[PDB]
From TrEMBL, chain D:
Location within or outside the cell: Secreted, Cell wall
Taxonomic path: Bacteria, Bacillati, Bacillota, Bacilli, Lactobacillales
Name by which UniProt lists this protein: Surface protein adhesin
Binding-site positions, Ca(2+) 1: 248, 250, 257
Highest rank taxon of the organism: Bacteria
Family listed: Belongs to the antigen I/II family.
Amino acid sequence: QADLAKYQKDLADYPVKLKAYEDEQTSIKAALAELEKHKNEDGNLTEPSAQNLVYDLEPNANLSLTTDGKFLKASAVDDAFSKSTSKAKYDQKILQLDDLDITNLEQSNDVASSMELYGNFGDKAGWSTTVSNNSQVKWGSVLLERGQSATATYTNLQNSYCNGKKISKIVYKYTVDPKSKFQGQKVWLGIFTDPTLGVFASAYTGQVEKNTSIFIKNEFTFYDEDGKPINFDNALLSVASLNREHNSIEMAKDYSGKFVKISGSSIGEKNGMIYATDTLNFKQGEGGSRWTMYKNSQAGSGWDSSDAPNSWYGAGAIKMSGPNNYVTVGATSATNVMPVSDMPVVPGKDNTDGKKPNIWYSLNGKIRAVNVPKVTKEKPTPPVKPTA
Amino acid sequence: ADYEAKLAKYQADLAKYQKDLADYPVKLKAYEDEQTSIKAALAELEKHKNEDGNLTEPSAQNLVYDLEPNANLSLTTDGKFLKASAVDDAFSKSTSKAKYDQKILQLDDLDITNLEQSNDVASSMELYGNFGDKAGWSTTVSNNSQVKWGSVLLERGQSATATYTNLQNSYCNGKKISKIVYKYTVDPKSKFQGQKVWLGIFTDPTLGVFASAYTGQVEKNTSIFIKNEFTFYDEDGKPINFDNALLSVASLNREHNSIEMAKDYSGKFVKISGSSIGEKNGMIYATDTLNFKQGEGGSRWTMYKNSQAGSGWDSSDAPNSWYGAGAIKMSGPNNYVTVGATSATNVMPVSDMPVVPGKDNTDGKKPNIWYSLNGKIRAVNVPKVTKEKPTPPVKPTAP
Amino acid sequence: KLAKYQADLAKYQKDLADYPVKLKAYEDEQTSIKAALAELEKHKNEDGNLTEPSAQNLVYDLEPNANLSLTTDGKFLKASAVDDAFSKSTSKAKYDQKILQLDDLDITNLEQSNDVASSMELYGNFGDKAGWSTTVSNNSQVKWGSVLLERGQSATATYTNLQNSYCNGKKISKIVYKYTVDPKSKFQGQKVWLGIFTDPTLGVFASAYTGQVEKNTSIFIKNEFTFYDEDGKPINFDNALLSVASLNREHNSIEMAKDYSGKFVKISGSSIGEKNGMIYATDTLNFKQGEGGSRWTMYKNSQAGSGWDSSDAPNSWYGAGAIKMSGPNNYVTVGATSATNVMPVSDMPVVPGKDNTDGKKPNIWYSLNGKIRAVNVPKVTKEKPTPPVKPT
Amino acid sequence: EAKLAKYQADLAKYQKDLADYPVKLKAYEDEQTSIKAALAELEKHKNEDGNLTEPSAQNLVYDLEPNANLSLTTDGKFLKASAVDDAFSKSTSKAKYDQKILQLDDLDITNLEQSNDVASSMELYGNFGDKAGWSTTVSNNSQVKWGSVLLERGQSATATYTNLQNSYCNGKKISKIVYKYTVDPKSKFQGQKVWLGIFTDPTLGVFASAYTGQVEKNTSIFIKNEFTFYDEDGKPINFDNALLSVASLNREHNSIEMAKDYSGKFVKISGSSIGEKNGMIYATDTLNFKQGEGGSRWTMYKNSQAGSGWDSSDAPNSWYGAGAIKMSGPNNYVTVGATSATNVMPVSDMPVVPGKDNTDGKKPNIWYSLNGKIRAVNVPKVTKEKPTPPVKPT
Ligand SMILES: O=C(NCCc1ccc(O)c(O)c1)Nc1ccc(O)c(O)c1
Ligand SMILES: O=C(NCCc1ccc(O)c(O)c1)Nc1ccc(O)c(O)c1
Ligand SMILES: O=C(NCCc1ccc(O)c(O)c1)Nc1ccc(O)c(O)c1
Ligand SMILES: O=C(NCCc1ccc(O)c(O)c1)Nc1ccc(O)c(O)c1
Ligand SMILES: [Ca+2]
Ligand SMILES: [Ca+2]
Ligand SMILES: [Ca+2]
Ligand SMILES: [Ca+2]
Ligand code: NA
Ligand code: NA
Ligand code: NA
């Protein structure tokens, strides 16, 4: 049919595609050869590896959402943000997600028929958030009980590829782990339209909680332009911003694939859990922490930043394969993880202090090790000429 | 005994040392006199810092970088080079065709859909503009003055790197600039509906770049943003560490429905007194008024020249150019800034916007922008630092 | 009470000692005033002279140290909020040059709910803004309290701590002055910012300006005032001359007074006259020399006689008139209006290059005081003294 | 025959004037040559300490009039020498009074506000008569006399100075000066009255005080000065680029002495603390009270330190606290006063002196003078008028 003109163009373009593929392969192999000489230096993967999951930022993605919980009205999200422990920041045109008291989301009058978006856009453009400051973020919100879930279909992806195949759709299921130890009965899930931004999960009702935890199970499958699942092939899933304070541990567990250590990172694997195993990582000098997670006077501080060079201090990876992968990410009181005997002691700070049962987390391909070569080009197949 | 070759070397170095030593007092006196003049000028400018067109904090300009019409441009990219054939063809069709048929290259009317075919791709950069068989044509850049640009087609995250050489008039803190390496990257946060961006990178580095995602229709809630990372090099190919250099961020147009801005920049914002341009939330733009038409949206002057006094401020010759300009004080060898255009609704709510009768602030805009980053600071009477403090020559030791 | 019949008798002794001096001062001031009026009757039709010669018994020119108290049925505005509004929108530019440009203030940023205060707060080029400039009196210090009013709403100002002002020789100790937004004003918004200056002779700035000029627009403030003496007793004006000044008329805008007690008094040669119960530039503009029949330019420039719109300008009278007033309670509405609201385009002066239908900002600065702009008007400062009474 | 005698005496007076005309003309031409050479020389030193930035001669010779006679009118109250002396003997003043010192800046004017303090005519007071040998803060051991008035805001006193002996303007002898002092209504002193001590020597200026014994925050006293100079014939003398010395503008950490609302143009002395900003002449950028404090180069009172005592009438570095006003025309004016620093600028903008509160209250008083004693160095004086040849009587 008219297939022969697309064959002509594909054939004219095949040598360029092939040379690009071979050049990138050459560069990747040279980069890995060099990285083998620094694999035990700070910020490097201990086992050198390329990244074939190019998946760092999708700010223009469109989000669709199903749930067996309740959708929340954007009105209700706004109202809850305007009250209780968040109200202060709300009055300074700041959306403080970790201060949101979800008690004001639990009325039945707050429930919507479909997902509605909220964030620092629209009539709140120019506000900033705790997620990306004044960069614009939008999220749909659901209210879940233990065991209930929300399924997010992200489309309109523009920058993400898997071993050179374009990722056109991501279907992600967030489930509230029933073994979570939060004192409340509901969880607010703010699912960002950008899938690389992950989710904010909160059972916070305005007071801190001892021996508490919130854990979200994540099951995801990636799809190409044909709606065909993409089988991961030693893809590197970035698990980053695993903060550990003196009284709180952010961790991942129950995951497919193999933990991948970043050399010099506080994050390691112990008893099937990925977290800061031996030191804190909140403030320099406290509990063996090398750097401060927020920015201040000290050099190397502010590592809990997406663009921070020493981001890797709070990050690790998971080597994954297959089309369906999963991992549970959450926050838990230190006492749930280990006895107080085993804990680092920080002068003036009680390890038994309560913590807010909330967490912001994301799972993407933005691996935090340095000089990780990306696999962006697929080996092209020769075009076939159509039959007349 | 081949200590004769070293002896000839030593003797010619000993004559060059003697000439350098003969010229050192003159160089030192010139440097000290320029320092005296600059300090007196800054002391004088401190008395006008709250008057129209003056820097809020008086400062000298040690980045002499306004004019390089003869520069040579080489270009790398991870996108696709565009043939001059293809650029011409795209200019000859669609929303651009009209002006093309009047022998005018209207860059902001170019529909880049006719640049997205693969037969349009070249293996190396090709130049296009109002020269050759199009000499005498007009462009929206410098009217009929001759301009040339190379073209690339990039997706989000892709980039083009421009090496400008053959520089003739540019200096930084008195060190002559011999090479500029400049990387233009398509910001993935751009909100244009397409997937491609045409970059026209002008051979004159002071002319900046034209970026366009325009496909023939305006777009609501749209934006195009280009990240710029640059390093300047001297005669020896050694990077030049900026020392409070003033990078002019100029012609930041704000219409009723669209804002041109700079953000994510190294250095600190430098205000021009009375300018529409200020800084808010880490972005440099017309924060509180428009600057398109006198009387519309609080703007003091009209950007195009007409009957009204002070109009045509969006020109290079315009004495009130500073009305649409600001600066960035920068230091270090590697500097960066993202410049772009975005629909007003992306920046602030309609509640907060200036109201212009008869014009919808939510109107779509073309996702394109022309911008340039140079040393042509638009404040008035800014003294230039042209002379570098000389080091005494060292005597060579005999062989 | 036995001690007071010695303090009143000691204060009587001094009152009796100065009564001859007070009486001599009164009688010569009377002589000088009568001679001045006799002379002025010979120039009453010369430029800058009152058409009907008259003395000024309202000494009321400058009260920079007066204290201002304020009630309202509108909303008080926080000084913080006023500052914030000045820092934004059409004023921001001048604000960043340490200038408070009152006629450029976009009052939309005063209409938020946090902007309201429980009591009047002062703002101006004082305090942490000392050394700043205003469009009111340039580098001189001015302070004003601010309210946000709807049509028909009002603010009442009590000025005390007056130091230099007198009425029929009687010292003025208190002025009560009510500003009301005329509901017939045609501005496009629903709110008006009132900046009421602590110096009552500086009047008020009224603005409905929202960042855009407006066609067929107007802002009008009703003024009802009563003056009080030391004993807190109202003072009955007796042909007092109220100066209605700086009535600017551009090609598209007319500043005027109307609905006033008393009778208009013309200054000979002034652009200002009375027509259809309104006091304004009746026949010519007064903005630029040669434009619309205007003799002089209101701002200072190249031309002789320019800069008439100044307190110290010798030809200020070109934009001023008077109102002869009597009684204790007087009133007048002052405002600005688009020329199209006053007369058809048929009747308007034609200025090449300028559209008479151009929109204008719905704001105005005005003041009503005793600084009559006619020349050589003798002032009545001395009261005829009453003989003291002896206590018993 | 009765008028042929007058024609003969006019013919001898013409004969005399004609005999003196060549000498007068040669003297004038020689002084013009000397002044032009001096200005040519001064232009090469115009940016050195103590020099006028734009070199100029001084044609207002007006330094010293100790024998001048003063007459005074007012719309306020004349003060008796009785009352001035009594007030000097009491309150914040009394101490210095007991050591035979008249300390004007310590005078509590509260004891001038009673009614038998009032006189029908000006009366003089000072370190003369039974107080000869006393000291004043004006000229210390030199004899000075002043008449005193009590004014409210807007009230004024007009001084006619005659019997002038040493002062000239563009070569014309000054025979009379009429000078009006008005209390600026914008003054912020807490009081309601001002004492004006107007010295018989017009070059000594005036002392203005609203001081009632306590310092005042956010305070100010300002006196408006309007003056016209007259020649032998009673004709006003039209100034022609005369230099009016605006001097002793002291700026402490909490107080600024300044001039404003002036006819003419400000003239800067190179290296002086005094400059012009927003139409006001004062120490614009540094204090000038004590060396090292607030950027001040020298100490205003005399002590050990070199260059100190600059606030002196003879001090060679007088120019450190001085500027000038180039004036023309017959009627000139300027308002001089003292004001709390907070009235001029925010504390943010103020020079910082450790241990000293910039918001401290100050006494609302000031001594100032406006004369021709220009404090820049080597300013050539213009003493000779171009003479006109006499005309012969008929
Ligand atoms: O790395 C992070 N998060 C920084 C930690 C943080 C910052 C501020 C807080 O207020 C806060 O609670 C936590 N964020 C990120 C975002 C998007 C990504 O695509 C991505 O790959 C990583
Ligand atoms: O240097 C320039 N560039 C030309 C701007 C322009 C753009 C598109 C056109 O179509 C056009 O005609 C002109 N003029 C300028 C720059 C910076 C300024 O702040 C400013 O106020 C004026
Ligand atoms: O002296 C005043 N008021 C202040 C002067 C002024 C300052 C800034 C302005 O923007 C402005 O409009 C007016 N009234 C006056 C002056 C001149 C007249 O011809 C007259 O009739 C009244
Ligand atoms: O010499 C004078 N005026 C009299 C000095 C004086 C004033 C008040 C006193 O209380 C006092 O004791 C002495 N004027 C002057 C002096 C020094 C200067 O640097 C300058 O610019 C001007
Ligand atoms: Ca975290
Ligand atoms: Ca532009
Ligand atoms: Ca007016
Ligand atoms: Ca002094
Ligand atoms: Na975040
Ligand atoms: Na251009
Ligand atoms: Na005014």
